[PDB]
Amino acid sequence: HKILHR
Amino acid sequence: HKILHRLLQ
Amino acid sequence: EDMPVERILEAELAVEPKTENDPVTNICQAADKQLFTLVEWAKRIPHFSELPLDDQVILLRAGWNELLIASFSHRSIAVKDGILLATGLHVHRNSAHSAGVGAIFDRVLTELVSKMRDMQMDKTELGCLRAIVLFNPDSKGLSNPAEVEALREKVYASLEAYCKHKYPEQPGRFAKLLLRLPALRSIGLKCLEHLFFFKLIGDTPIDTFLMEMLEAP
Amino acid sequence: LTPDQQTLLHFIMDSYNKQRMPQEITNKILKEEFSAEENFLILTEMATNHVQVLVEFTKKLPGFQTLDHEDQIALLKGSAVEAMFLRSAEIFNKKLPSGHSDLLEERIRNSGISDEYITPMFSFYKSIGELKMTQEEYALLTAIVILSPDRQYIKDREAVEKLQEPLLDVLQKLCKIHQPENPQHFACLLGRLTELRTFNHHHAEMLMSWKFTPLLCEIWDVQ
Numbered sequence: 389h390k391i392l393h394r
Numbered sequence: 395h396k397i398l399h400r401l402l403q
Numbered sequence: 404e405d406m407p408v409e410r411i412l413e414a415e416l417a418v419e420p421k422t423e424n425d426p427v428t429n430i431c432q433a434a435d436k437q438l439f440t441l442v443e444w445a446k447r448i449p450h451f452s453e454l455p456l457d458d459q460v461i462l463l464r465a466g467w468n469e470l471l472i473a474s475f476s477h478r479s480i481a482v483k484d485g486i487l488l489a490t491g492l493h494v495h496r497n498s499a500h501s502a503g504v505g506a507i508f509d510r511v512l513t514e515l516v517s518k519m520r521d522m523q524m525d526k527t528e529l530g531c532l533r534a535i536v537l538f539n540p541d542s543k544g545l546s547n548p549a550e551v552e553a554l555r556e557k558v559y560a561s562l563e564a565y566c567k568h569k570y571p572e573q574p575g576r577f578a579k580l581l582l583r584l585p586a587l588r589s590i591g592l593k594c595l596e597h598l599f600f601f602k603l604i605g606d607t608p609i610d611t612f613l614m615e616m617l618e619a620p
Numbered sequence: 621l622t623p624d625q626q627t628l629l630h631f632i633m634d635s636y637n638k639q640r641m642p643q644e645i646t647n648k649i650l651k652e653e654f655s656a657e658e659n660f661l662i663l664t665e666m667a668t669n670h671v672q673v674l675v676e677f678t679k680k681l682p683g684f685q686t687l688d689h690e691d692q693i694a695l696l697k698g699s700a701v702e703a704m705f706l707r708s709a710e711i712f713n714k715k716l717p718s719g720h721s722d723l724l725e726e727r728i729r730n731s732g733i734s735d736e737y738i739t740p741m742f743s744f745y746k747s748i749g750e751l752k753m754t755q756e757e758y759a760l761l762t763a764i765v766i767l768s769p770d771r772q773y774i775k776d777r778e779a780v781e782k783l784q785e786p787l788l789d790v791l792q793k794l795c796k797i798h799q800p801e802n803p804q805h806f807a808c809l810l811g812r813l814t815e816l817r818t819f820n821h822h823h824a825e826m827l828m829s830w831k832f833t834p835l836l837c838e839i840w841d842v843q
């Protein structure tokens with residue numbers, strides 16, 4: 389997901 | 395308790 | 404060893420063979436039938452009956468779900484896109500999806516049935532795995548955890564013993580077997596979630612011994 | 621154990637050591653007798669910092685980056701919670717001053733989390749404590765937790781499997797070496813992997829039975 393996806 | 399206790403004898 | 408894998412294998416063979424309308428109800432029917440056989444299976448496992456009585460209660464009451472799932476998943480190697488129940492019924496994948504429970508059903512097939520087939524898992528290995536699941540020291544409120552843990556280590560030793568002699572050109576078979584146990588735990592916890600829900604909405608014939616396993620004692 | 625296996629270990633060990641020292645973590649909780657609801661803020665922060673160092677640790681695993689870029693997300697949020705408990709267990713069982721050990725235990729118990737969930741933890745921490753694990757065994761076992769092929773939404777399971785294999789062989793050999801006293805120590809270890817799945821299962825339910833940072837909402841599926 390958002391943060392975690394880079 | 396009832397069933398399990400029993401079969402273990 | 405002091406944990407003979409043939410005498411564990413005997414317990415596996417000496418509680419099985421039977422040839423011969425909702426999906427979930429049929430599984431719950433089978434689950435109840437097989438809980439009775441399970442207790443007879445547990446005594447046949449070395450040093451089990453020799454433990455305390457309230458300890459045998461806690462082990463079986465803690466791991467019954469994983470153990471039964473293990474033993475029907477191995478039976479279901481023959482069948483494909485499905486599961487073979489102890490009552491001689493075949494529950495097909497597609498029939499599982501429409502009854503609501505496709506997600507947990509497919510995980511059983513991929514992580515247990517398929518894996519068991521692909522590594523051609525034999526009945527001795529199944530029994531040793533189940534014997535480990537049975538001897539769970541982590542079980543809550545059990546009298547002497549060290550006794551349990553000790554018995555588990557004897558099974559480990561012996562299952563390793565058995566794997567090196569029977570399959571010497573697979574050094575990492577012993578580990579690969581042991582890695583089914585976590586996947587088994589995760590599925591078992593998900594199947595108990597589902598069952599607690601199915602009990603509490605009322606819609607499903609839950610017979611006596613399956614009911615007893617689900618009600619806090 | 622082979623010089624190729626032996627050099628693979630060193631990258632893990634190097635990568636693992638970027639973690640906050642146990643003493644740092646220890647210090648943050650046992651320093652000031654905290655408000656029950658500020659213990660939440662502290663624990664929240666730790667877990668957030670753990671996730672950050674964990675992501676970095678996974679990136680450098682051979683070869684984690686060859687995997688599908690949506691299976692990396694599956695692997696991460698499928699193992700984040702389990703990774704944490706293993707690291708807590710590592711921290712909790714590291715030797716402390718006289719009385720500090722018990723004081724830590726009771727401060728965690730005084731955090732609003734239920735005894736339902738707390739008693740199982742300290743029993744799991746006491747469990748891996750008695751395995752007298754080395755730092756290396758910890759880090760290889762954490763790596764094996766992360767590269768677990770049976771996580772949810774894993775589009776390509778067979779890829780993950782073959783990444784996990786190498787680590788298991790090293791961990792086997794290391795177990796022989798560091799503990800030939802306990803001949804079934806390797807198996808005893810994989811045993812703990814199982815027990816970590818119950819933490820994964822209940823975590824969601826634990827938090828919601830008594831806020832969160834952005835990264836935690838995401839990787840734990842909570843709000």
Ligand SMILES: CC(C)OC(=O)C1=CN(C(=O)c2ccc(F)c(F)c2)CC(C)(C)c2c1[nH]c1ccccc21
Nearest residue numbers: 645646649663664666667670704707708711712728
């Ligand atoms: C291991 C490092 C990374 O610290 C932790 O993350 C946590 C460790 N946890 C610990 O038990 C723990 C153990 C030993 C320690 F020294 C410690 F500081 C913390 C778990 C828990 C569940 C209390 C927790 C932790 N974080 C939480 C966040 C929310 C809600 C709960 C938590």
Ligand SMILES: CC1=C(/C=C/C(C)=C/C=C/C(C)=C/C(=O)O)C(C)(C)CCC1
Nearest residue numbers: 433434437471475488489504594597598
């Ligand atoms: C996996 C599965 C479930 C199983 C529950 C249990 C505990 C089953 C045991 C079955 C036995 C014991 C069959 C047999 O012996 O043939 C439930 C319904 C929750 C969800 C859908 C499929």
